[PDB]
Design a protein around this nucleic acid. Structure first.
Lengths: 329, 83, 99, 96, 110, 98, 83, 103, 97
DNA sequence: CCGGCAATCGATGTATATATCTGACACGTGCCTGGAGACTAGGGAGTAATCCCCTTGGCGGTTAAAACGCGGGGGACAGCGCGTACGTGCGTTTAAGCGGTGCTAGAGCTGTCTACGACCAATTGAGCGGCCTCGGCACCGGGATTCTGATGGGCGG
DNA sequence: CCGCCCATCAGAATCCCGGTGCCGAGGCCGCTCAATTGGTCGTAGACAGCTCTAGCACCGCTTAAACGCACGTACGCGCTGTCCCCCGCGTTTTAACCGCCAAGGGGATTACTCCCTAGTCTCCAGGCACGTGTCAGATATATACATCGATTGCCGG
């Protein structure tokens, strides 16, 4: 046991190959190259009773559900009964002791000078502070920054098909709930596979990827149950999130506050369909496509997407949408 | 038939705009009637020729080819449509 | 007192503005109505393609612009600034269109 | 060597003139003018008919093409009477 | 008999202009691959009608001038005094024809 | 007491006289010389038939008469009875000849 | 032999006679030069076309039919001289 | 191919076929299509170069009918050739008489 | 079902344009105008050549008729260059037939 | 006591009536080449059935363009005076027009024969039509800048 | 004492950037069929020779037309004054344009006859070249007749 030094997991050579990506209350996610492969290093401070980004840090046991869910969903890709390759697989996880290396601080300074950061400096951390280092595969760029270079609505139909298949597979496998899905959480990458393959509850099926592979990030508040043991982070006290306004996400938050009467220990797969409804509203009102609607085939495709968006709410779960809806049959 | 007195749809500002493109600075008050008459005559000739062309082919729809052929026969070639 | 340009300035501004653009200067629906009304005299229950009406409009506008140019030349020849129907008649007579 | 032969329309024009005015003559220059007029009209009508036939993707010239060319070329009343004449002729040729 | 008497196509059509000559000219003129059987009759009838009209007007003009022979001046007078004929022959020049007498009213003395 | 006509009577008499006949109004030898001189700039040692010269003369006279008619119309339009070169220029410009 | 200064052979009385046939009552003193220029241009065009026609046929004599063809091509059909 | 031996870019076989079935003459020689293709290519190249110059003047990288009209109307020979032709979406050349200008 | 194919001059016009101006594009309407121009010129020259062949009592069309038609139909400066280009093309074709 | 309006009076150019003389026009004849009669083979054109694309029609919202009124300044139009360029006529000079005479360059026609174009069979690659991406081009919105039109303020022979 | 020039003020016209929406190139397949290659075969036209029509050059004689000059007057052109009638700007009313959605009418494609036209052979009658008179028109002469320009002769304010 015991934490390992910075050179144990991120030495100097792969320290200088580095570029910043994302930040948050928990920690920061950050890009590098290791083993001739682009990887993401995610650093979270733990065991620290110090106010960071407006709050202190929890313990390792609080993070433990998150890594549990992460490696369970990674193994879901290697499952036989329910297989889907549209998720993110881990590499490893380790513990780090010490202060923030200066290269990290200079990368943060460059990011703030270029993109701007709302988080505090990471340079006040001591040499005895404990962090958790986590490794992810490079899944591409977010949907938000990619909103104005998409080809046509066929790529849409494809990515909805793939995400719904992934959620249905996850539900059939371990009764997984995400409870957070915004258009900044979808990662798309260019792949040469014209037709991708997967398995749901023991049946083989395929998705036309249109030369595009998809993924969605891990969720800190995701809820699931394995063998009767429920893993979920209680959100009944953070009512500020559900009392917000300005766009549809807070509306979805109050719906997921009202439909399960604050008893979050149970399982309610219905709100997932409203989470998808939010994405449909976004695609029909928050993206630009590079192909004109002149051709009637994709015009009727768009109308079919529209009636899906209007009529999905009368189902019970994403599996029902996958197995019954016209766009999915 | 129902369609009648549609020559009045060529408004005075439209004739003014055409004159401005032609390069005219001052316009008298008796030009609009003459312009309407000459436009009517021109349209009558062209449409008569086009309808004859579409009649010879045993069709009931006037196409752009008939108009182009009639204009070429009249001595005014037009580029950009079919051809 | 509110600003007022002298008579003749806005005319030159419009002349300079309309000689640089290329779009049509007549509304489409009235022209279509006129074309259909004229064509109903030769044959009953006819049908039209959009390109036919567009070509008719282009030819008519070009003819009218050329006629107005010739009329302006005729009016200038007689030590005048305004154009009158006699100028149109003279231009059409010399062109050979009228008898 | 032997002199070649020249063809014209003088005899037919003279026959028509004797039909219309039975006591009038004509000179040489007028005969030349009428010959040129007939040739010019023949060329115009034949060319128009050929263009009409080519437009519709046909490989033959019939009386319909001639009638349409006459209608397109001749102005006003001159067309109407002319058309009638042609029709009558064809009908007679069919009877015998 | 082996053969019957020859009958011209003009006689059957009741015309005066030649039909066989017009058929030959149409065939050897590079107009179309084939030529029908009714086109020459139509063309001959039209040409004969036009010739008759022009000759009638010219003969009237000649008789007006107290003569018994048609000269190009009479043809010009006949052509230029009729609207349809003038429109048809609008770009044609007749040799030894002349012009129509016409003086503007402004030039006349008071 | 010599007899003298007012300005304009003889002009009208000539207008009436020359609109009734059909002869040619230009001498033949100068026209033939001009035709040969113009033609010599395109080829050398050319020969002509008399019919060609006659046809050229007829066409030229007809063209000139029509042009003069148009010039008279233009001169009348501007409140005048005398023809001037500007009338010829305007007539040629409107007719389409550069 | 080479010819020169022949445009002066179109004398002033000839132009006056042509104007009188045209219907003109008074003539300015500067019309003759313009008339000579116009005639020169017209003759140049027609003669050039006729000479090209006679050169294609491999001949050394200009015939009347060449002039008739040139006039017809120009748009000034002429009746009487054959063809 | 015949067009490659002559160093041309316009088709030669297609021109021959269009000449042979257009009712022009009984027989067609073996040199006419080459001449016709060369002439057509030359004229097209000239017009295209002028239009491209006009387009580059206006700070654009594509040619539109306004550019073709500007190129044609500003050249004497091309204007004389297309003296009775109307181009759609063409416009007119800017020109104002001097008398109408203010003092 | 596939429609009947239609012939045009787009490919060759684009090739010539790339030969002259290496970095310029063109719009669809301009291409249609160019197609119409090519067809019109072809028809004019062919008709003139046919009339020329008929006048001299011949039954074949050769390059002499095309040259004379080009001389008659085009103004002088264009005519000279067109004649030079046509003669060069014919000579090159004949030499390496 | 004139400026006029009509009525002559003379002179000039044009239209009209009569007698002779010619050459262009209206038939007669012989002959040959182009049109008519008779028959066969095959392919261009007519007809029926089917598919689906493009034209016609309807409804609601918004807003840019058409319609109407009014004050006033600049242009169209008539009247007048002056000067010179153009019309009319006469005497003298020039070259067109007509009638022959002579010579030869070139248009027009005929007979041989060779090369060039039409036609056919087997091969194959150029060109067109569906489906799909997409990198840059044209597009607008803002702001800033500029430039031009309409104005009052003055030194002077 | 009539001004004709200069310095200010407002309002269009044009430049620079930033973010969006599509289009014109490109790629693939899959054909389809039109162009290329290698032969034979019948005739269009190039070439050489000959005949003779018409285009060119020269000379002499007549007479009509072109040319130069003098004289007078009517027409073109510039200036002034008056009044109507289009131009510029503000307010209110009408319908054009954009988006979307059905209904079906007629244009385009495929398959199957079959009658009309091209081609060939034989034969003779219509039309063209050539040759002769005779009479419609051209020419010459004399004779009215309409019209233009000047002079007279009264005439009412």
């Amino acid at each position: 046991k015991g934490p390992v030094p910075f050179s144990h997991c991120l030495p100097t050579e792969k320290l200088q190959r580095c570029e910043k990506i994302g930040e948050g209350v928990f920690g920061e996610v950050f890009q590098t190259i290791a083993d001739h492969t682009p990887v993401a290093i995610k650093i979270i401070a733990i065991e620290g009773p110090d106010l960071v980004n407006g709050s202190h840090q929890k313990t390792f046991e609080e993070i433990l559900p998150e890594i549990i869910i992460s490696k369970e969903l990674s193994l879901l890709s290697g499952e036989v009964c329910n297989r889907t390759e549209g998720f993110i697989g881990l590499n490893s996880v380790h513990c780090v002791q010490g202060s923030y290396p200066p290269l990290l601080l200079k990368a943060w300074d460059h990011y703030n000078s270029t993109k701007g950061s709302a988080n505090d400096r990471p340079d006040f951390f001591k040499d005895d502070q404990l962090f958790i280092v986590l490794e992810f595969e490079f899944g591409g760029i977010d949907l938000e920054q990619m909103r104005t270079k998409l080809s046509s609505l066929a790529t849409a139909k494809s990515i909805l098909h793939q995400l719904t298949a992934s959620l249905a597979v996850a539900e059939a496998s371990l009764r997984f709930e995400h409870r957070d899905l915004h258009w900044g959480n979808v990662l798309l990458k260019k792949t040469s596979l014209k037709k991708l393959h997967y398995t749901l509850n023991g049946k083989s099926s395929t998705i036309p990827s249109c030369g595009l592979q998809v993924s969605i990030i891990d969720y800190t508040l995701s809820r699931l149950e394995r063998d009767g043991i429920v893993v979920f982070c209680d959100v009944s006290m953070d009512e500020d999130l559900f009392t917000g306004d300005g766009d549809y996400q807070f509306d979805i938050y109050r719906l997921m506050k009202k439909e399960n009467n604050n008893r979050w220990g149970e399982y309610h797969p219905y709100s997932n369909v409203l989470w998808l409804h939010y994405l449909t509203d976004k695609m029909l009102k928050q993206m630009t496509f590079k192909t004109k609607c002149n051709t009637p085939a994709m015009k009727q495709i768009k109308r079919k997407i529209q009636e899906f968006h209007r009529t999905m709410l009368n189902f019970s779960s994403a599996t029902d949408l996958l197995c019954q809806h016209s766009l999915f049959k | 038939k129902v369609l009648r007195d549609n020559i009045q749809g060529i408004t005075k500002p439209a004739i003014r705009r055409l004159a401005r493109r032609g390069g005219v600075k001052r316009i008298s008050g008796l030009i609009y009637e003459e312009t309407r008459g000459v436009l009517k005559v021109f349209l009558e000739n062209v449409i008569r020729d086009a309808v004859t062309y579409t009649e010879h082919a045993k069709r009931k729809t006037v196409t752009a080819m008939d108009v182009v052929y009639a204009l070429k026969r009249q001595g005014r070639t037009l580029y950009g449509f079919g051809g | 007192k509110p600003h007022r340009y002298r008579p003749g300035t806005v005319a030159l501004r419009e002349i300079r503005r309309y000689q640089k653009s290329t779009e049509l200067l007549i509304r489409k629906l009235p022209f279509q109505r006129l074309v259909r009304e004229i064509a109903q005299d030769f044959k009953t229950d006819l049908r039209f393609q959009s390109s036919a009406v567009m070509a008719l409009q282009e030819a008519s506008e070009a003819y009218l612009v050329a006629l107005f140019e010739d009329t302006n030349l005729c009016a200038i020849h007689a030590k005048r600034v305004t154009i009158m129907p006699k100028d149109i008649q003279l231009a059409r007579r010399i062109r050979g269109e009228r008898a | 060597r032997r002199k070649t032969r020249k063809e014209s329309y003088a005899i037919y024009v003279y026959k028509v003139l004797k039909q219309v005015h039975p006591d009038t003559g004509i000179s040489s220059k007028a005969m030349s003018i009428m010959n040129s007029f007939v040739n010019d009209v023949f060329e115009r009508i034949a060319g128009e008919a050929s263009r009409l036939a080519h437009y519709n993707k046909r490989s033959t010239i019939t009386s319909r093409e001639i009638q349409t060319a006459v209608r397109l070329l001749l102005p006003g009343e001159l067309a109407k009477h002319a058309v009638s004449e042609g029709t009558k002729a064809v009908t007679k040729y069919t009877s015998a | 008999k082996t053969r019957a008497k020859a009958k011209t196509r003009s006689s059957r059509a009741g015309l005066q202009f030649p039909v066989g000559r017009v058929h030959r000219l149409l065939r050897k003129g590079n107009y179309a691959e084939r030529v029908g059987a009714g086109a020459p009759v139509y063309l001959a009838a039209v040409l004969e009608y036009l010739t008759a009209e022009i000759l009638e007007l010219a003969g009237n003009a000649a008789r007006d001038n107290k003569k018994t022979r048609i000269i190009p001046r009479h043809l010009q007078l006949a052509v230029r005094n009729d609207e349809e004929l003038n429109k048809l022959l609008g770009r044609v020049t007749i040799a030894q024809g002349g012009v129509l007498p016409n003086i503007q009213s402004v030039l006349l003395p008071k």
